[PDB]
């Protein structure tokens, strides 16, 4: 495996926070990138109480990322699979995961990064960067299934990237994935057909994208605050959807609306989202997006 | 001062505003020669031209024009030549300039993987290049490909005099047009390698820096290097005013630094690099 | 997870041998089977040197076995995923893996179990049992890909059962699996089409079945002994196959010939194999076989 | 010596040969009553009949026939009743036998898949008791404990004629295929011990009733193993017990006990594993080594 890194090359410096299956640490890696003696990285681990299923997805995420190359998708750098504990080494995203970043921007935050909340132009930029990454993932024929602010990361120039694929599934042959058995699911981010039949598609992923825009405009507030999971589950399957957070730009509200169409066939594709926003983005976008790349044919 | 200024701009979210003022206060000088009808095919972009007072003049009778500017920073004691990525028909001119200005190094910042630049250097040791129009020969002597940058050793020969010179070519490959580097560390790592190579030495002519337009990424690279030099030459490093250093550089070439994000990155890189050279 | 078992209830007693990904131990498990205070079991573990792919396959085997219920398929009893090392607990097969069992029956065997070599009747019986387990696996829409004497197990009454699924792949949607990247493969057991194009089907599994019969008739001799893997690969793709072991019963030879037809669509199915041997089997076969069960529709 | 005998048979591959001898040397007695025309529908298999001398006689003048045999083992001091899986029309007879012979336990070995080669002769629900009008008996499920490979049920049997009641413990081993052997010697022994623990095999009660489908293969293995363990336990020298001889003795009471060579081998296997701790004549020091 050319992704295998020798353990001594990795030093864990500190905890960055809890991830999908375990504590994520900031580490220092010696000679892992040709031309650079030392690199700051993010190292993922799995908690001791992780179940079989969880352990399986943790490892799966490392395996699938090996095949990704997209500016808006967190990059895998390597794996320490020899001996325990297993370590998944990834590029370090300076501002952490989108949810935490968003919350630290609240006026009442205690860990404020000395920066104000996202402007409309920033919100749109983030939207397009996330849609682009998702468009890329969909082109590779994978359904994400767990799109949420917590699974997105923020770089030093605030670029947002998809960085957690703990529930991703292959859809090459059918374009969808059906949940056979049981298991814990993120109910507040799920589309009605997913809550009902356990069916997941790029379209149910579009539903999630809309909730992420909601998280952005509310600074990572809990979706459907005031309702229990059971109520949410029933509310969404019966045609209900999230309300607009105060001060949420009207233009972003129009995006959410189209992501929350009850019929999945009525929802836009990620490529449509990007196409819709293409004339209101940073000059560097066409240089790095999957949308403008030759691979998008 | 510098670092507190940075935090002050971040807190009020004024980068666009600060960057805007810089554009408004920037020098406006004549570009008569670059706009001549016979020079249109020598410019990659209509809106990016070298000022007449600081443009590099080719030492030839035919046409002495090339889209390149000499940025001479008196206080930092360093000169730089910023130019556009050569076009297929200006590759000979590009090397004539490198030769006439006695440059020892070239810094290229075009993003790899369809460049907005012509292939002006040999792809293989055995396939040297000859520029008939300027009577020059270029041979790749060695190439070391790293993760985000490549360092090439080239031998340039003036065929008219048969004199030879070694040129070091440094290519940062992960910097998107109108964008910023993947990280301040990789950026600084590249900068330091270029400095260590001796290519930025005063005994040599100005280092040639380019990407596509030769103002955005090219300007960030030069602004950062210059600010670190200035800090090294003062008792108090935090007193350096990045905004003023940029306006000074803009007296020699228009539009240095194309986005407020590049301006912010420069501050980041200069602040992080300073804490490294100290 | 209803299969998760408390580590304190498992005690490793001794080494049984090397499995696909690590050392297999014999253990004593207290209160894991209702009505039985203590149970002797087989515990699978993964070596510290296992690669990312191997670890994924090890956990994957445990996961797929959860849904299997067949007399001729080794049964999963539970898993210990809390902490390390991960343990996969299965029913203990009194006479270990078929390869080891066969070799210990050779006249020069030092560790002879105190029993003579298999008769023709015992061989037919083993053939039908293995084929039955494979028919079941295929009906569940999985391709085994690694059928070999070492991956089969022998019970106290000598009933053979499929006991390893380290390379098993789901073929529900397409009925086949194509190898993407590169990887380590059991060359001597592979069908030509699988060697040439990395294509695996129930037919290629049938090819392997033929090699397992060869292993049975030669008492676990090494397939193509004396030839390197590079030579085996070239040989089989060019239409070659194993010679009939000296003094091999003709009834079995006829079986291998069918399994080693160059054209995969010319090879019989597992059900066809069982149907072929159905009249010369032990009285209990119809009572426990997948072939005679109502599930075989 | 039983164990060395086992290894010698295994080594020479003689199981089939030994089993063949046992069949050739087995007792042959008349089964006239079982072969009577009026009893055609009381037999599950035409080839499995109880000898006339040891058959269980129902206490009724109508027709006293039932395919059941009393196996009395004098030296072991234990008796067993082996019978076929009751038929739809013989469920009343089955319980009459249970009542009349004063049995306290029933051992069932049918494999739960599918359908059992045995009619449903006991209640599925506590609230749905069963009444066998032909023999004037009521049967009620009192409790049921379902476990991994066996289930234990408590049943109240009431003779409606005398209003007397008895508790019957019903043990059903569910993972033993017809013509086959138990998942393992240990699970089999665990089942045997659970039955012994209940007190269903005690001399104080009538013979335990054992059945499956025919009541000779799996039913015979169960009884042979139990008897050999008894004999080994009350004999100064455990190793002197000869399984072959015990089986031939048992076959004097019912034909075909132990249907295959595999079941014969398993019996040896289970007895040896179950006798591992019987001291015999060894001393504390010897039994320590």
UniProtKB/Swiss-Prot annotation, chains A, C:
Phosphotyrosine found at = 172, 176-177
**Residue intervals on the Cytoplasmic side:** 1-297
Q: What is the effect of changing residue 207 to L?
A: In IRAN type A; accelerates degradation of the protein and impairs kinase activity
Query: Can you tell me which residues bind ATP?
Result: 20, 44, 91-97, 150-151, 164
Residues annotated as domain Protein kinase: 10-285
**Which consequence is recorded for altering residue 148 to T?**
In IRAN type A
> Mutating residue 167 to I: what's the consequence?
In a patient with insulin resistance
Catalytic site:
146 (proton donor/acceptor)
* Residues recorded as bearing S-nitrosocysteine in the entry: 70
Question: Per UniProt, what does mutating residue 188 to Q do?
Answer: In HHF5 and IRAN type A; interferes with kinase activation by insulin
Provide the cross-link position: Glycyl lysine isopeptide (Lys-Gly) (interchain with G-Cter in ubiquitin). 66
Q: What's the effect of swapping residue 130 to T?
A: In RMS; reduces insulin binding
Q: What is the effect of changing residue 146 to N?
A: Loss of kinase activity
Impact of altering residue 70 to A? Reduced S-nitrosylation by BLVRB, leading to increased receptor tyrosine kinase activity
Source domain of life is Eukaryota
Instruction: Please give the name of this protein.
Output: Insulin receptor subunit beta
Record organism: Homo sapiens (Human)
Lineage here is:
Eukaryota, Metazoa, Chordata, Craniata, Vertebrata
Curated annotation (Swiss-Prot), chain B:
Catalytic residues, per the record, are: 211 (phosphocysteine intermediate)
Tell whether Transport is among the UniProt keywords. Answer: no
Q: Which residues bind substrate?
A: 177, 211-217, 258
S-nitrosocysteine occurs at which residues? 211
- Location of Phosphoserine modifications: 49, 238-239
| Protein name, per record | Tyrosine-protein phosphatase non-receptor type 1
Family per record: Belongs to the protein-tyrosine phosphatase family. Non-receptor class 1 subfamily.
Per the record, the covalent cross-link N,N-(cysteine-1,S-diyl)serine (Cys-Ser) lies at 211-212
Q: What is the lineage of its organism?
A: Eukaryota, Metazoa, Chordata, Craniata, Vertebrata
Q: What is its EC number?
A: 3.1.3.48
Q: Name one GO biological process term.
A: positive regulation of JUN kinase activity
Topology of the protein relative to the lipid bilayer: Peripheral membrane protein
Into which EC class is this enzyme placed? hydrolase
Full protein: residues contained: 2 to 282 of 435
Cysteine persulfide PTM positions = 211
- Primary localization class, coarse: endoplasmic reticulum
Substituting residue 49 to A/D results in: No phosphorylation
Q: How does it assemble?
A: Interacts with EPHA3 (phosphorylated); dephosphorylates EPHA3 and may regulate its trafficking and function. Interacts with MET. Interacts with NCK1.
Tyrosine-protein phosphatase domain sequence ranges = 2-273
Sorted keywords for this record are: Acetylation, Endoplasmic reticulum, Hydrolase, Membrane, Oxidation, Phosphoprotein, Protein phosphatase, S-nitrosylation
UniProtKB/Swiss-Prot annotation, chain D:
- Signal sequence range: none
Tell me yes or no: is Acyltransferase among this UniProt entry's keywords.
Answer: no
**Active site annotation, chain numbering:** 212 (phosphocysteine intermediate)
Similarity-based family = Belongs to the protein-tyrosine phosphatase family. Non-receptor class 1 subfamily.
Subunit info here reads: Interacts with EPHA3 (phosphorylated); dephosphorylates EPHA3 and may regulate its trafficking and function. Interacts with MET. Interacts with NCK1.
Q: Which residues carry this modification: Cysteine sulfenic acid (-SOH)?
A: 212
Provide the positions where the record notes the PTM Cysteine sulfinic acid (-SO2H). Answer: 212
* S-nitrosocysteine: residues bearing it: 212
Q: Which organism is it from?
A: Homo sapiens (Human)
Its recorded name reads Tyrosine-protein phosphatase non-receptor type 1
């Amino acid at each position: 495996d050319e992704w295998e890194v020798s353990r001594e090359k990795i030093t864990l410096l500190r905890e960055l926070g809890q991830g999908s299956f375990g504590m994520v640490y900031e580490g220092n890696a010696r000679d892992i990138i040709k031309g650079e003696a030392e690199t700051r990285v993010a190292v993922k681990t799995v908690n001791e109480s992780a179940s079989l299923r969880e352990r399986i997805e943790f490892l799966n995420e490392a395996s699938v990322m090996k095949g990704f190359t997209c500016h808006h998708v967190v990059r895998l750098l390597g794996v320490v699979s020899k001996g325990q504990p297993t370590l998944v080494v990834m590029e370090l995203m300076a501002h952490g995961d989108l949810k935490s970043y968003l919350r630290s921007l609240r006026p009442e935050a205690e860990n404020n990064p000395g920066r104000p909340p996202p402007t409309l132009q920033e919100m749109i930029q983030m939207a397009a960067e996330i849609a682009d990454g998702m468009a890329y993932l969909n082109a590779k024929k994978f359904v994400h299934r767990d799109l949420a602010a917590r699974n997105c990361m923020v770089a030093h120039d605030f670029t947002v990237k998809i960085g957690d694929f703990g529930m991703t599934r292959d859809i090459y042959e059918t374009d969808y994935y059906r949940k056979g058995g049981k298991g814990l699911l993120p109910v507040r981010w799920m589309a009605p057909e997913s809550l009902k039949d356990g069916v997941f598609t790029t379209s149910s992923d579009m539903w999630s994208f809309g909730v992420v825009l909601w998280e952005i405009t509310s600074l990572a507030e809990q979706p459907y605050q005031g309702l229990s999971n059971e109520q949410v589950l029933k509310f969404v399957m019966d045609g209900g959807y999230l309300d607009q957070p105060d001060n949420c730009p009207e233009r972003v509200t129009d995006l959410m609306r189209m992501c929350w169409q009850f019929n999945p066939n009525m929802r836009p594709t990620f490529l449509e989202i990007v196409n819709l926003l293409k004339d209101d983005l940073h000059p560097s976008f066409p240089e790095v997006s999957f949308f403008h790349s030759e691979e998008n044919k | 001062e510098m670092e507190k200024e940075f935090e002050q701009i971040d807190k009020s979210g004024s980068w666009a505003a600060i960057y805007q003022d810089i554009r408004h206060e920037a020098s406006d000088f004549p570009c008569r020669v670059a706009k001549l009808p016979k020079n249109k095919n020598r410019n990659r972009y209509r809106d990016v031209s070298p000022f007449d007072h600081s443009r590099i003049k080719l030492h030839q009778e035919d046409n002495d024009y090339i889209n390149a500017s000499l940025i001479k920073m008196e206080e930092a004691q360093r000169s730089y030549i910023l130019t556009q990525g050569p076009l297929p028909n200006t590759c000979g001119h590009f090397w004539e300039m490198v030769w006439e200005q006695k440059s020892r190094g070239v810094v290229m910042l075009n993003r790899v993987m369809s460049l907005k630049c012509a292939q002006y250097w040999p792809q293989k040791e055995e396939k040297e290049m000859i520029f008939e129009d300027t009577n020059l020969k270029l041979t790749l002597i060695s190439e070391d490909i790293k993760s985000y940058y490549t360092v090439r050793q080239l031998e340039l020969e003036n065929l008219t005099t048969q004199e030879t010179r070694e040129i070091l070519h440094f290519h940062y490959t992960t910097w998107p047009d109108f964008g910023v580097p993947e990280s301040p560390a990789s950026f600084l790592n590249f900068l330091f390698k270029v400095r260590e190579s001796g290519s930025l030495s005063p005994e040599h002519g100005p280092v040639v820096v380019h990407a596509s337009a030769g103002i955005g990424r090219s300007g960030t690279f030069c602004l950062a290097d210059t600010c670190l030099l200035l800090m090294d030459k003062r008792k108090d490093p935090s007193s350096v005013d990045i905004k003023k250093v940029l306006l000074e550089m803009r007296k020699f070439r228009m539009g240095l630094i194309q986005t407020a994000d590049q301006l912010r990155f420069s501050y980041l890189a200069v602040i992080e690099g300073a804490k490294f050279i100290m």
